[PDB]
C-alpha cells in the first residue's frame, strides 16, 4: 500500500494473505538459527590450551587464536574474513555473534589437540601428542614404529604443508566461490524485488498518489486493483524462491554437521 488508506481498504477484501508469508519467513529464520546452533554447538564445555606448547615438534601457531588481536580470531580466520566482501524489508541479526562461534571453534580445536578423540564420548583425557599420532597411524594399518622413527621428518612436512596452504589461500582468489555465490544470490533477489515496485502492470501510472489525485474514485479504483494484484504476485514469487533456496541450504548444513561430527571428533 505504501501508506494509503484506500489501498488498505481495497486490500482488506483479499482475506488473510500475508499472514502466510510472515509465517513462512519466520520459519525460515528459525531454521537458520537452528542450523548454525546444530553445526557448531557440539561440546559440553569450553577447553583451553596450556600456556606452554611443546607438541613433539608440531606447530599450530597459524591456527590457534591470537589473544593479541581484539577479536581473538586466528590468522586463517582473519584471511577468510577479509577476502570475502527500504520499504518494509527488514534484516534480523543472527542469534549467535561471531565471537561465540570463534570461541566454539577454539574450544573444539584445543580439545582435539589435547585429548584426541576421547572428549567426543566422555570426559577429556590427556595424552601426549606423539602418542596420539602413533594411535592414528596404527588406525590406518601402519605399525606405530614408523612415526617414532620419522617424527622429525613428519613434523617438518606438516609445517611446510600448513605454510603452503596459508600462502595459497592468501594469494589465490576465487577460492571461496560458494559463500560469495550465496551472498550475491540473496542481494540480487532483494534488489529485483525492490526494483519491481516501479511497473504499471497495465495502469496509467506507477506511483499511487498521482493515481489518487488524477481520477475520481470509481475510475481510480481499477488502477489501484491492478497495482495490488501485480505487487502481490511479485511478493509470492519472492517468497517461493526463498523457500527453495532455504531447503537447499538446510541440506548443505546437515552434510556439514555430519562431516564435522565424524571427521573431527574421530578418525574416519
Amino acid at each position: 500500500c505504501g501508506d494509503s488508506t484506500e489501498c488498505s481498504n481495497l486490500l482488506l477484501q483479499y482475506g488473510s494473505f500475508c499472514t502466510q508469508l510472515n509465517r513462512a519467513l519466520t520459519g525460515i529464520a528459525v531454521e537458520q538459527d537452528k542450523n548454525t546452533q546444530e553445526v557448531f554447538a557440539q561440546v559440553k564445555q569450553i577447553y583451553k590450551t596450556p600456556p606452554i606448547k611443546d607438541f613433539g615438534g608440531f606447530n599450530f601457531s597459524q591456527i590457534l587464536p591470537d589473544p593479541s588481536k581484539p577479536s581473538k580470531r586466528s590468522f586463517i580466520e582473519d584471511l577468510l574474513f577479509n577476502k570475502v566482501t527500504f520499504n518494509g524489508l527488514t534484516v534480523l541479526p543472527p542469534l549467535l555473534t561471531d565471537e561465540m562461534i570463534a570461541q566454539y571453534t577454539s574450544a573444539l580445536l584445543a580439545g582435539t589437540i589435547t585429548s584426541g578423540w576421547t572428549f567426543g564420548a566422555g570426559a577429556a583425557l590427556q595424552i601426549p601428542f606423539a602418542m596420539q599420532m602413533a594411535y592414528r597411524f596404527n588406525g590406518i594399518g601402519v605399525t606405530q614404529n614408523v612415526l617414532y622413527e620419522n617424527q622429525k621428518l613428519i613434523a617438518n612436512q606438516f609445517n611446510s604443508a600448513i605454510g603452503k596452504i596459508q600462502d595459497s589461500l592468501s594469494s589465490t582468489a576465487s577460492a571461496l566461490g560458494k559463500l560469495q555465490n550465496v551472498v550475491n544470490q540473496n542481494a540480487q533477489a532483494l534488489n529485483t524485488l525492490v526494483k519491481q515496485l516501479s511497473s504499471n502492470f497495465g495502469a496509467i501510472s506507477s506511483v499511487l498518489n498521482d493515481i489518487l489525485s488524477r481520477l475520481d474514485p470509481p475510475e481510480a479504483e481499477v488502477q489501484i486493483d491492478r497495482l495490488i494484484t501485480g505487487r502481490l504476485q511479485s511478493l509470492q514469487t519472492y517468497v517461493t524462491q526463498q523457500l527453495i533456496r532455504a531447503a537447499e541450504i538446510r541440506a548443505s548444513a546437515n552434510l556439514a554437521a555430519t562431516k564435522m561430527s565424524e571427521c573431527v571428533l574421530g578418525q574416519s
Binding site: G56, W117, G120, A121, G122, A123, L125, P128, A130, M131, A134, Y135, Q144, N145, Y148, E149, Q151, S261, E262, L265, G266, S268
Partner: protein, 109 residues
C-alpha cells in the same frame, strides 16, 4: 563405528519402537569414568634394543612399569609376548630404561 551417528559415546546396540507417524530409537552406549593420572613412555630400551607394545600402552604407578589396554585400567607385567622389537634405543624421543621379562629362561631351569 561412525562416531556420534546413533548414540552418544561408543555404540553397542539399538531398539526400534513405533510412534503415530514415525519411529523412536533407543540407543545403548558405553561411557567410561573414574579416571586416574599416570606416567607414560613411548618405548622401552633393554639390552640395547627398543620394545614397543603389541596392543596397549606403557604406564607407571610411580615405581614399576606395566602395559594396559587403552580403554580400561588393567596392568600386566611387561613380557616378550605382548611386545615387539625393532631397532635400537638411540633414535626414539622419550624412551626409558627397564627390563623385559621372558618366560622361557626361568622355565628351562
Amino acid at each position: 563405528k561412525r562416531v556420534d551417528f546413533c548414540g552418544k559415546g561408543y555404540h553397542l546396540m539399538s531398539f526400534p519402537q513405533s510412534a503415530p507417524h514415525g519411529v523412536v530409537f533407543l540407543h545403548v552406549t558405553y561411557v567410561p569414568a573414574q579416571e586416574k593420572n599416570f606416567t607414560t613412555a613411548p618405548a622401552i630400551c633393554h639390552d640395547g634394543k627398543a620394545h614397543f607394545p603389541r596392543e596397549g600402552v606403557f604406564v607407571s604407578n610411580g615405581t614399576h612399569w606395566f602395559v594396559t589396554q587403552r580403554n580400561f585400567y588393567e596392568p600386566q607385567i611387561i613380557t616378550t609376548d605382548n611386545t615387539f622389537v625393532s631397532g635400537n634405543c638411540d633414535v626414539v624421543i622419550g624412551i626409558v630404561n627397564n627390563t623385559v621379562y621372558d618366560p622361557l629362561q626361568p622355565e628351562l631351569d
